[PDB]
Amino acid sequence: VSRIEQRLIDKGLKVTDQRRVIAQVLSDSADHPDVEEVYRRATAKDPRISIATVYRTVRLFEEESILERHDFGDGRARYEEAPSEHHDHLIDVNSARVIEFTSPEIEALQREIARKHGFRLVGHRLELYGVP
Amino acid sequence: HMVSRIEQRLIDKGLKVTDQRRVIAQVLSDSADHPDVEEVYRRATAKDPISIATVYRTVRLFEEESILERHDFGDGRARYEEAPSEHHDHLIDVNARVIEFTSPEIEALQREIARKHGFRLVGHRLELYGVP
Amino acid sequence: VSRIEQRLIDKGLKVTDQRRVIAQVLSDSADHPDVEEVYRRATAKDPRISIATVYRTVRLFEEESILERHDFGDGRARYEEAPSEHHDHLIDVNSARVIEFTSPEIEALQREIARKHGFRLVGHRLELYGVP
Amino acid sequence: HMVSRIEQRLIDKGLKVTDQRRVIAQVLSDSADHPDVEEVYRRATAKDPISIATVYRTVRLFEEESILERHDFGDGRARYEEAPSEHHDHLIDVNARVIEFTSPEIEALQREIARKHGFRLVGHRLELYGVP
DNA sequence: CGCGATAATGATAATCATTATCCG
DNA sequence: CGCGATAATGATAATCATTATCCG
Ligand SMILES: [Mn+2]
Ligand SMILES: [Mn+2]
Ligand SMILES: [Mn+2]
Ligand SMILES: [Mn+2]
Ligand SMILES: [Mn+2]
Ligand SMILES: [Mn+2]
Ligand SMILES: [Mn+2]
Ligand SMILES: [Mn+2]
């Protein structure tokens, strides 16, 4: 077996060839690509693949914590393979590189801001725009 | 109060002020909250003629021209507000009021993160989502 | 104006950039391509294009006699720019070339076969499979 | 009549004849019409246990093995029949009975068209659609 | 004429026939 | 095990917010 299939086998999901390929595509990606970009990269590896399927997988994979959905501004949701720890993003406004970053002190403050306004933080989003 | 903060900005920016641009300028200057475009249409009919096509065109120009801030609060439609002289961020009740806040310290850290990466931050999006 | 836009202008349809491009794609095509193949060829000419739009156009263009829909066997419908006269197809089973062909005597026989079984022929389909 | 034309073909072709393959073989040998897969399922339940998954798998094998002819009559589902010793073609009531026919002369011409093109025809699809 | 009326666009979900997975 | 139960697939239509076209 492999990392993709094992997750699916353990998560009670049917391992299909396309789920496998989509999984692999996200696996060796540097950038955060939109759903089409995944569809293209998948169909390059294995043609037996629908856009409808690439949409159905991302939703599920997100629901199952196998991949994270971001939304950096443009209509398109960008997708990345869920990482070992949470990370936020710093977008270079010039040559649009993305920098993953982690800050423990912030998440705390953020949950403190929740418990101040009588809230429980079910999720957050932090993106920082920058220039050299 | 006879010419709104935003109508003043159009004037300064040399852009032509139509009765509808004026009306939507009213509505946006009025609002402490963050209406979607539909609410900006309703709020603008409670004053004058204004078409939907138009309300759309306008809140776009305004946004393009830095007069407005567009928010996506994970609920379909875009939501809008006048560009705040006093920067705030957003806690969203996932169930649906949007409490605005400022953490002088989250700001503090954000600046450091960008510094510690060799990037001066020129904007950021920080949103919190939760329940009580 | 041009051939595409004139048809649309005369057919009471809004000329959009994508309708224009899709039209052009079909215009300089040798083969009969599926909807994806059109989507790819379109996006090569002008990126501002949805698959959903490429689907919506083909239906309309067919409904408006601007392009013909065939179905040569595989799931995919193939599409060609509606020609000056009806033609049927001869598929080379070896190196899958398609040969357009016209036969007046057959259509007659076909309408005779209609009027024999008390029918009115609203449409037909003839494809011939061949080898050298 | 105890082993059907089609069960005989499996036997000859060395393929394994299961009770369900046998039953669907019955049903297909029985039918003068052209049932969709659902009707082939109903007709096969009116004899034995047979699952839908299975009816699908079978009429596919049969079709793959040249025992069956698949038709698409422009109405969603595929429709099926035993491979006729006597070739016919199809007039479809667009409103929904399918009268079978033979034009010894359309056959005549088809052969010529392919000849006049330098191709021996090894199969053809000719369907007529109409109302009274 | 920048606007209104309105239909087209685009991202993505839905539908439904057919297909593959999994399991016993 | 080729099968049943069932969910996944693929082509394509539907939805709905936003956008462009056209016209006066
Ligand atoms: Mn964070
Ligand atoms: Mn990331
Ligand atoms: Mn902030
Ligand atoms: Mn605000
Ligand atoms: Mn013909
Ligand atoms: Mn043709
Ligand atoms: Mn024939
Ligand atoms: Mn028949």
Residue numbers in the entry:
A (entry chain A), C (entry chain A): 2 to 133
B (entry chain B), D (entry chain B): 0 to 48, 50 to 95, 97 to 133
Task: Give the text the authors published on this PDB structure.
The sequence in the final co-crystal of the Fur-Mn2+–P. aeruginosa Fur box complex was 5′-CGCGATAATGATAATCATTATCCGC-3′. The functional structure was generated by a crystallographic twofold axis. Surprisingly, binding of two Fur dimers to one dsDNA target site was found in the Fur-Mn2+–P. aeruginosa Fur box structure, with one dimer bound close to the 5′ end of the coding strand and the other dimer close to the 3′ end. The electron density corresponding to the P. aeruginosa Fur box was sufficiently well resolved to allow unambiguous assignment of the DNA nucleotide sequence, except for one missing base at each 3′ end. The two Fur dimers are positioned on almost opposite sides of the double helix, in contrast to the positioning of other prokaryotic helix-turn-helix motif class repressors, such as the trp repressor. In contrast, the two Fur dimers do interact, mostly in the DNA major groove and between the two antiparallel α3 helices of the Fur dimers. There are two hydrogen bonds, two water-mediated hydrogen bonds and two electrostatic interactions at the interface between Glu37, Tyr40, Arg41 and Thr44 of each dimer, suggesting that the inferred cooperativity arises from cross-dimer protein–protein contacts. Arg57 also forms one hydrogen bond with T15′ of the P. aeruginosa Fur box. The negative electrostatic potential in the minor groove of the P. aeruginosa Fur box is enhanced compared with that of the feoAB1 operator, which might further increase the binding ability. Thus, cooperativity can explain why the P. aeruginosa Fur box can tolerate the loss of shape readout by Lys15 when a Fur monomer is positioned at the end of a DNA fragment in the crystal structure.
